[PDB]
Ligand binder design. Structure first.
Ligand SMILES: *[C@@H]1O[C@H](CO)[C@@H](O[C@@H]2O[C@H](CO)[C@@H](O[C@@H]3O[C@H](CO)[C@@H](O)[C@H](O[C@H]4O[C@H](CO)[C@@H](O)[C@H](O)[C@@H]4O)[C@@H]3O)[C@H](O)[C@H]2NC(C)=O)[C@H](O)[C@H]1NC(C)=O
Ligand SMILES: *[C@@H]1O[C@H](CO)[C@@H](O[C@@H]2O[C@H](CO)[C@@H](O)[C@H](O)[C@H]2NC(C)=O)[C@H](O)[C@H]1NC(C)=O
Ligand SMILES: *[C@@H]1O[C@H](CO)[C@@H](O[C@@H]2O[C@H](CO)[C@@H](O)[C@H](O)[C@H]2NC(C)=O)[C@H](O)[C@H]1NC(C)=O
Ligand code: NAG
Ligand code: NAG
Ligand code: NAG
Ligand code: NAG
Ligand code: NAG
Lengths: 599, 49, 579
């Protein structure tokens, strides 16, 4: 199992680097989670590493190369979830040298059984043999799909006598196996034999070894612990005569093509299924352990695969005004800052990045490959508290910081959780303050194989130049130099900034302890010297009253002109500065409890 | 081969120093050959590791 | 096309005189019976031709205690057996002796669950000539058959055309067709012995071709002529992008078939099923009704008979009458039996009193049935339920009736607010003092093509005319629930509060009124009466033509409010000099 590609006909580097990239990516890969794109490969390339591929999720693209054979003898299922040109799941084009010295002559796809979506495009291949002798409608599932297979070969030999005119090559081991066009009239799909009792299950992708949902080669929808099913077990059982729905004692959730006992902690649960985000008519609601979708808030969507944009840019960044939670990924690429003249998109004003200072959660990944040359940190994301990781870069990555050559610190001072994925922070020649940071307090679960932080500013020079974070910070470290960028303070914080102590026994703005932070005492509280000033910020939590006492509360003066359950209320001060109600016949106040004391 | 260099306007298709090529074909098909450190259909992304 | 079955088993008809009409209305035009098909206690030569259209039965088929020679069920293909007759048996033919001579079940080739009873029928000849093993499904069954051969009749051999002697009756069209036990391979059903002639995996009873569109009956669900394992979901899931989205091709499940919208009287659900009750932790919500989840604690639910702790309770008695106090809607049925208003020494339960029945005064909606076979002899009507608007009929008495009145002493029906009988039949019979039944617009209360009123033995129409029992002269269509001006279905003049009247007190008298959409309502106490003209334009102190006492703009008042004002010589309030 490995990730696929999406480069189309483009390539990176020279002929040897194009091959080494292809080799390393697919070296022991059985299932390609994307496209299989083999473009401009040389005539002497060893492609035997592809022999283990059984299944392709997207399309198979083979173009403008010079190798003689395509060694995919085990590829059975091509799902076509992504389609080349919008039509074709297999695209084979121009695979020959213009001087005819080298060309592709054989596609070794002898086990290819089914294409679940899309057609077949095999065109312009002067030396490619046996393509008009393949019963391609036995393989292509969709009856409305386009099949070309035209200008391929000239003097090519016929199929071997044992193949009955249907083959992938000249040999007796090259014959095509027909699994759909020779079936019993009743079966609507692939078979394992010609009898009406020898047909494959409706949920199978490609062939099968028997008629059961556990004899199946691959599933079309969900795999329920070995059994292919159209849906996972539902919470309610329906009675066709009484029209009742009874609870199902054995339910499961739908998650990415497999049935699971419970939904992953970083996903939101819909009706029996786990999704990255809720439907347009639902919002995410926090429950016990898991999140759920319920019957909305602004649809502040992100960038990357599944969205309309590949990066934040001068025509996209305005969509995040007043955004607190981004659905999906947030990508910053070089073209997103410098501009993209191909689409008439101007360069981004560096100070428009301040629109992200209100974002507290990103449900996907954060990917920064470009940042303005005068911005030495990512303080624009100082308000970010969670990276959800429900959609990851390539596979596994939930945070990327690559080659930002003017950045000295990470920032993200409010960040408490990265719920899933891997961290890649590398090649940033100025980046220094990350070396002391303890990632097991930020990244959830085991971290032994998830933290990739190579190169950057050497730690030796970072400490030697005096870049170790403020001494007030505890073991675990900081996001930068300041006392406000620490994960946790040694003693107390004051508004999120680390301090040596609180103003408990002394200090004009007297304070009290609460949740390891310093908080001020009530304005009417009497300051203490040598003992605690207060136990809270309320009018009844102080050690002594600064002015006048009114029952349990301290006040600056006794109240006058107050309207309560019985109308106007007036109180007078006593010799000890205590407030008491005035006589029943007083007007606007009094000097005592008696009738003669009224004003 | 089967590829030719892109025209003065078309050379704008690819980014980050990549060289733009055309496939010789009724519809236009655009290629770019990226530097070793860049990938993606237009060379717009960095290569990891 | 689609209708429900009954729940009588072997019990007597509630009103024998209307029993054949009950069966006619329930089954006339049905192809699919979504319940048990019960044909019992029929007279000799009954008019049974309305049964010829039935092709499927969801539950059991019971034919018992009938004098008829034949039952026209030749088109019946499949009996699904969802409920069985006692347990064990899906087809039962019992005590039909006069009596049945032939089974005639020409099209029946499938029973999915249960066995067969054919017992004590001293006329029936063709119960031994059926290969019942070919009719039972391939799937695991009890498949038990108990066949009574004690017929005492000189039976004719079946037509020589019936090769192998398998037959439903004497005629050449009565030969049994064998569709499981005569075919090559492992196929559950077939057209013929050859390996090319098997039916599709989703076919039941048989087929006209090998495709899932060629079936005679669907084993699981029918989707617009196509037989499917599961009905298409309303909402789908993308395994590559981890998102859900609506299915443009999604359908609701309704019994054994798929529909585009959930049928009337059923609650829709987001999972795609149509039900009669909601799943646990939900609420019924109107739009047409749907079930929705209790995202906050569920509201008070007033349960009736047949639901939760009252499932085994026959009737409302002095022990459970209080459980309905303050309720607007009852989730269940109501039954008033001779034991409700009498004593029960088994638990020392007191009889209900007329003043205890008042607990239903607030009731507007019943989800089940209203069955009244006893009522106090001191109450001339059913006015205890005068505020009842809707009877849904989701639970039916004997599986057929939603409103039943038997043997009551009431002079007229008290149900003046009733506007809907959502499902089921109405049965009113043997009420010798009850006159106002023919005066009720029953065609405006029924909602379904299979509803009707069945009645007999009530007060004769000619005796009502003689005595003087008729609708009030102001009833809009000549339609009413009783003799009074408050009991009209609609009023030709004014509705006052709860009464139809000739005129509204707008132009003449002291207690003046105004008219609003044919309701006649009083003017504000501070409004001055206008002699020969309009008094007021509404119930408020600022809507009158003139002030009765002193003006306090915009309204009239008896005494000036504390700015403190006084009643001046102008006929209006003015600020006081004392402050
Ligand atoms: C799956 O469900 C579909 C409905 O979605 C169901 O289709 C209906 O089947 C019935 C018969 O099984 C069809 O009714 C007949 O159609 C023919 C068409 O020409 C008419 O000739 C028939 O009318 C004659 O018979 C009547 C009998 O009393 C006479 O009164 C009348 O005068 C005529 O002589 C009759 O209407 C019905 O048309 C279809 N509906 C559709 C839309 O096709 C289907 O059978 C179900 N399949 C399975 C396998 O369960
Ligand atoms: C359904 O899922 C199961 C895993 O639960 C898959 O079984 C594994 O298949 C690989 C194939 O090489 C074997 O190496 C493993 O040993 C299998 N696991 C077990 C527990 O047997 C199965 O292949 C899937 N089936 C389909 C049809 O997709
Ligand atoms: C980084 O953080 C982790 C998690 O807080 C620290 O691991 C904990 O260390 C204390 C030390 O006594 C143990 O009591 C806990 O049980 C540890 N937690 C877990 C989950 O193992 C770790 O010490 C910190 N520092 C470093 C350098 O890793
Ligand atoms: C939302 O956006 C507008 C943009 O001008 C701004 O005026 C407003 O104050 C914003 N703030 C919040 C908190 O909604
Ligand atoms: C972040 O960078 C800006 C300029 O890029 C600088 O003024 C500021 O002091 C930095 N903040 C910290 C905490 O280093
Ligand atoms: C988010 O930004 C506002 C800006 O004033 C700030 O008050 C708030 O404390 C920040 N929240 C977090 C989680 O950092
Ligand atoms: C009545 O029916 C049973 C059916 O098995 C049979 O055993 C019994 O001998 C019959 N005969 C008479 C004469 O009652
Ligand atoms: C009452 O009956 C009359 C008869 O013509 C009709 O005009 C009026 O609309 C009816 N009112 C209601 C509420 O149905």
């Amino acid at each position: 199992v490995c990730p696929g590609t999406l480069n189309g006909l483009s390539v990176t580097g020279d002929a040897e680097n194009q091959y080494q990239t292809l080799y390393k990516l697919y070296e022991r890969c059985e299932v390609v989670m994307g496209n299989l794109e083999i473009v401009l490969t040389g005539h002497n390339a060893d492609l035997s590493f592809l022999q283990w591929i059984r299944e392709v999720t997207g399309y198979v693209l083979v173009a403008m190369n010079e190798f003689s054979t395509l060694p995919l003898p085990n590829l059975r299922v091509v799902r076509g979830t992504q389609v080349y040109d919008g039509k074709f799941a297999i695209f084979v084009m121009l695979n020959y040298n213009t001087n005819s010295s080298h060309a592709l002559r054989q596609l070794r796809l002898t086990q290819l059984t089914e294409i679940l979506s899309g057609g077949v495009y095999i065109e312009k291949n002067d030396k490619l043999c046996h393509m008009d002798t393949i019963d391609w409608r036995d393989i292509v599932r969709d009856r409305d799909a386009e099949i070309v297979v035209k200008d391929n070969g000239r003097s090519c030999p016929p199929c071997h006598e044992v193949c009955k005119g249907r083959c992938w090559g000249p040999g007796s081991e090259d014959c095509q196996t027909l699994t759909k066009t020779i079936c019993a009239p009743q079966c609507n799909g692939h078979c394992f034999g010609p009898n009406p009792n020898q047909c494959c299950h409706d949920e199978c992708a490609g062939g099968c070894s028997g008629p059961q949902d556990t004899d199946c080669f691959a599933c079309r929808h969900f795999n329920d612990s070995g059994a292919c099913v159209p849906r996972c077990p539902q919470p309610l059982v329906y009675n066709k005569l009484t029209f009742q729905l009874e609870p199902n004692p054995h339910t499961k959730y739908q998650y990415g093509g497999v049935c699971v006992a419970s939904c992953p902690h970083n996903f939101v649960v819909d009706q029996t299924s786990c999704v990255r985000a809720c439907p347009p008519d639902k919002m995410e609601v926090d429950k016990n352990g898991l999140k759920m979708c319920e019957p909305c808030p602004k649809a502040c969507e992100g960038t990357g695969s599944g969205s309309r944009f590949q990066t934040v840019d001068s025509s996209n960044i305005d969509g995040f005004v007043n955004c607190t939670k981004i659905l999906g990924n947030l990508d910053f690429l070089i073209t997103g800052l410098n501009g993209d003249p191909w689409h008439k998109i101007p360069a981004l004003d560096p100070e428009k990045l301040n629109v992200f200072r209100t974002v507290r959660e990103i449900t996907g990944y954060l990917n920064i490959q470009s940042w303005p040359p005068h911005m030495h940190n990512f303080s624009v994301f100082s308000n970010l508290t969670t990276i959800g990781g429900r959609s990851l870069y390539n596979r596994g990555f939930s945070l990327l910081i690559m080659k930002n050559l003017n950045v000295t610190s990470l920032g993200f001072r409010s960040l408490k959780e990265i719920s899933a994925g891997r961290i890649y922070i590398s090649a940033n020649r100025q980046l220094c303050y990350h070396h002391s940071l303890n990632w097991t307090k930020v990244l959830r679960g085991p971290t032994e194989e998830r933290l990739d932080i190579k190169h950057n500013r050497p730690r030796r020079d970072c400490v030697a130049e005096g870049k170790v974070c403020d001494p007030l910070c505890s073991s675990g470290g900081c996001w930068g130099p300041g006392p406000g960028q620490c994960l946790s303070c040694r003693n107390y914080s004051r508004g999120g900034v680390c301090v040596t102590h609180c103003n408990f026994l002394n200090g004009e703005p007297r304070e009290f302890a609460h949740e390891a932070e310093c908080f001020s005492c009530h304005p009417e509280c009497q300051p203490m010297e040598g003992t605690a000033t207060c136990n809270g910020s309320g009018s009844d939590t102080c050690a002594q009253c600064a002015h006048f006492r009114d029952g349990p509360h301290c006040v600056s003066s006794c109240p006058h002109g107050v309207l309560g359950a019985k109308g106007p209320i007036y109180k007078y001060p006593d010799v000890q500065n205590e407030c008491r109600p005035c006589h029943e016949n007083c007007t606007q106040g009094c000097k005592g409890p008696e009738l003669q004391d009224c004003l | 081969s089967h590829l030719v260099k892109c025209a003065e306007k078309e050379k704008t298709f690819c980014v980050n120093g990549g060289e733009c090529f055309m496939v010789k074909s009724n519809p236009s098909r655009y290629l770019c050959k990226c530097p070793n450190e860049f990938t993606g259909d237009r060379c717009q992304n960095y290569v990891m590791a | 096309q689609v209708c429900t079955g009954t729940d009588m088993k072997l019990r007597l008809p509630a009103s024998p005189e209307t029993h054949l009409d009950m069966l006619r209305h329930l089954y006339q035009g049905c192809q699919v019976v979504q319940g048990n098909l019960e044909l019992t206690y029929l007279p000799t030569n009954a008019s049974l031709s309305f049964l010829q259209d039935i092709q499927e039965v969801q539950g059991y088929v019971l034919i018992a205690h009938n004098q008829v020679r034949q039952v026209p069920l030749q088109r019946l293909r499949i009996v699904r057996g969802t409920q069985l007759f006692e347990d064990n048996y899906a087809l039962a033919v019992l005590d039909n002796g006069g009596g049945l001579r032939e089974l005639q079940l020409r099209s029946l080739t499938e029973i999915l669950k249960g066995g067969v009873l054919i017992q004590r029928n001293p006329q029936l000849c063709y119960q031994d000539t059926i290969l019942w093993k070919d009719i039972f499904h391939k799937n695991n069954q009890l498949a038990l058959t108990l066949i009574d051969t004690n017929r005492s009749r000189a039976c004719h051999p079946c037509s020589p055309m019936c090769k192998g002697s398998r037959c439903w009756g004497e005629s050449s069209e009565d030969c049994q067709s064998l569709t499981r036990t005569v075919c090559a391979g492992g196929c559950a059903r077939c057209k013929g012995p050859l390996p090319t002639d098997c039916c599709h995996e989703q076919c039941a009873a048989g087929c006209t071709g090998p495709k899932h569109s060629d079936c005679l009956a669907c084993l699981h669900f029918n989707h617009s002529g196509i037989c499917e394992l599961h009905c298409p979901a309303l909402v789908t899931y993308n395994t590559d992008t981890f998102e859900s989205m609506p299915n443009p091709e999604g359908r609701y499940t309704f019994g054994a078939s798929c529909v585009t919208a959930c049928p009337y009287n059923y609650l829709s659900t987001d999972v795609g099923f149509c039900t009669l009750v909601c799943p646990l932790h939900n609420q019924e919500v109107t739009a047409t009704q749907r079930c929705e989840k209790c995202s906050k604690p569920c509201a008070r639910v007033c349960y009736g008979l047949g639901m939760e702790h009252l499932r085994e309770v026959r009737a409302v008695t002095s022990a459970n009458i209080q459980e309905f106090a303050g309720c607007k809607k009852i989730f269940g049925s109501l039954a008033f039996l001779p034991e409700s208003f009498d004593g029960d020494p088994a638990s020392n339960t007191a009889p209900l009193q007329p003043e205890q029945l008042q607990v239903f005064e607030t009731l507007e909606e019943i989800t089940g049935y209203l069955y009244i076979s006893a009522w106090p002899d001191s109450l001339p009507d059913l006015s205890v339920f005068q505020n009842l608007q809707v009877i849904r009929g989701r639970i039916l008495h004997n599986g057929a009736y939603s409103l039943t009145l038997q043997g009551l002493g009431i002079s007229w029906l008290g149900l003046r607010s009733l506007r809907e009988l959502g499902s089921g039949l109405a049965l009113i019979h043997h009420n010798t003092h009850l006159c106002f039944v023919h005066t009720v617009p029953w065609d405006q209360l029924f909602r379904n093509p299979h509803q009707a009123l069945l009645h007999t033995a009530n007060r004769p129409e000619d005796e009502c005319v003689g005595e003087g029992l008729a609708c009030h002269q102001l009833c809009a269509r000549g339609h009413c629930w009783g003799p009074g001006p408050t009991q009209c279905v609609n009023c030709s003049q004014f509705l006052r509060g709860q009464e139809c009247v000739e005129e509204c007190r707008v132009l003449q008298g002291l207690p003046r009124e105004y008219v609003n959409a044919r309701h006649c309502l009083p003017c504000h106490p501070e409004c001055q009466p206008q002699n020969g003209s309009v008094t007021c334009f509404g119930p408020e102190a600022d809507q009158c033509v003139a002030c009765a006492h002193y003006k306090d703009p915009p309204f009239c008042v008896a005494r000036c409010p504390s700015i403190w004002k006084f009643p001046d010589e102008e006929g209006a309030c003015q600020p006081c000099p004392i402050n």
